């Protein structure tokens, strides 16, 4: 009886599409690789908003 179930499982393994998995993990980007965007966001927040509106917000880093 065990051999029949073994053969059934073997055939099921032969029939199921094989799935290979690749895993990647990422983190926040470097300042250098952000490019001119870094300067174009600092012109918008570091000087404009705070000095000409005084909103006093709490915001994360550009990166």
């Amino acid at each position: 009886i065990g051999l029949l179930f073994a053969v059934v499982a073997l055939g099921y393994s032969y029939l199921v599409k094989q799935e290979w998995g690749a895993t990647s993990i990422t983190d926040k980007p470097t300042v250098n690789m952000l490019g001119g965007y870094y300067s174009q966001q600092q012109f918008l927040r570091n000087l404009d908003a705070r000095s000409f509106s005084s909103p006093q917000p709490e915001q994360p880093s550009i990166s």
């Binding site: 895993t23 990647s24 993990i25 990422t26 983190d27 926040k28 980007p29 470097t30 690789m33 952000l34 490019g35 001119g36 965007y37």
Partner: peptide
Amino acid sequence: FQTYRYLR
């Protein structure tokens, strides 16, 4: 521009 850093 690239907005990620590879660790894995």
